[PDB]
Design a protein around this ligand. Sequence first.
Ligand SMILES: NC(=O)C1=CN([C@@H]2O[C@H](COP(=O)(O)OP(=O)(O)OC[C@H]3O[C@@H](n4cnc5c(N)ncnc54)[C@H](OP(=O)(O)O)[C@@H]3O)[C@@H](O)[C@H]2O)C=CC1
Ligand SMILES: CN(c1ccc(OC(F)(F)F)cc1)c1ccc2nc(N)nc(N)c2n1
Length: 186
Amino acid sequence: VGSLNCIVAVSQNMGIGKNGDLPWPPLRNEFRYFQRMTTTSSVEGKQNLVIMGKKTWFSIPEKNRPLKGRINLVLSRELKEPPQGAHFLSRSLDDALKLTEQPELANKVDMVWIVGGSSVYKEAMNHPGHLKLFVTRIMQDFESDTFFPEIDLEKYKLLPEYPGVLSDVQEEKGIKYKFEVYEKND
Ligand SMILES: NC(=O)C1=CN([C@@H]2O[C@H](COP(=O)(O)OP(=O)(O)OC[C@H]3O[C@@H](n4cnc5c(N)ncnc54)[C@H](OP(=O)(O)O)[C@@H]3O)[C@@H](O)[C@H]2O)C=CC1
Ligand SMILES: CN(c1ccc(OC(F)(F)F)cc1)c1ccc2nc(N)nc(N)c2n1
C-alpha cells in the first residue's frame, strides 16, 4: 500500500449529496480533477484503489461504473457479492484496508482513495496514521441531504500547496470553487 486519502467536493454548508446525486449542477473540470487524482499512480505497474459506500456506487451513472483505471471496492453489510461491475466487497473499512494486505492486492495497490459517502469518510478521518483529505470547497450553500463530517483542525492542517493541485479560485457554471489539501499524522 502507498497511502490513505479521502477526496470530496463539499458546499459551504457541508453538503455532498442530495437525492442520490450531487447538490449542484455538473462542474466538468471538478469531475476531471476527481478522475485525475484518483487514477494517477506514481508507482510503476500498480493502480489505485477507490473505496466507496453502496449508495455512492449507485450514484455513478452505469456507463461510468466501475470508475475506469481504478480498482473499485464497495462497502456493504447487506450485499452478498460486489454490485454488478464492481471488483470487491467489504463489510467494514478495517476489512477493506486488511484486504489490501492480501496476496491478490498487496503488490497491485498504490494509493487508497476514499471517495464517499459520509460514514466512510467519518471513519477514515478518525483512522490513526498519516491521512490526507483532498477537499473541493464549492463556495455557495446548496440544499443537501448528505454531509461531510467535521474536519478536526487540531489534527488536520491545511497545506499551502500540493503538486498537481491548482491553488487559485476556479469558476464553472457561475459557481466558484477552490481545491484544498489537508494532512494529519497521528
Ligand atoms: N460530493 C462528493 O464528493 C460526493 C458525493 N456523494 C453523494 O453522496 C450521496 C451518497 O452518500 P451516502 O448516503 O453517505 O452513502 P454511502 O455511499 O456511504 O452508502 C451507504 C451504504 O454504504 C454501506 N456502508 C457505508 N459505510 C460502510 C461501512 N463503513 N461498512 C460497511 N458498509 C458501509 C452501507 O451499505 P448496507 O446498508 O448495504 O450495509 C450503507 O447503507 C449521494 O447523494 C452521492 O451522490 C458521494 C460521494 C462523494
Ligand atoms: C460521486 N462521485 C462521482 C459521481 C459520478 C461520476 O460519474 C462520472 F465519472 F462523472 F461519469 C463519477 C464520480 C464524485 C463526483 C465528484 C467528486 N468530486 C470530488 N472532489 N470528490 C469526490 N469524491 C467526488 N465524487
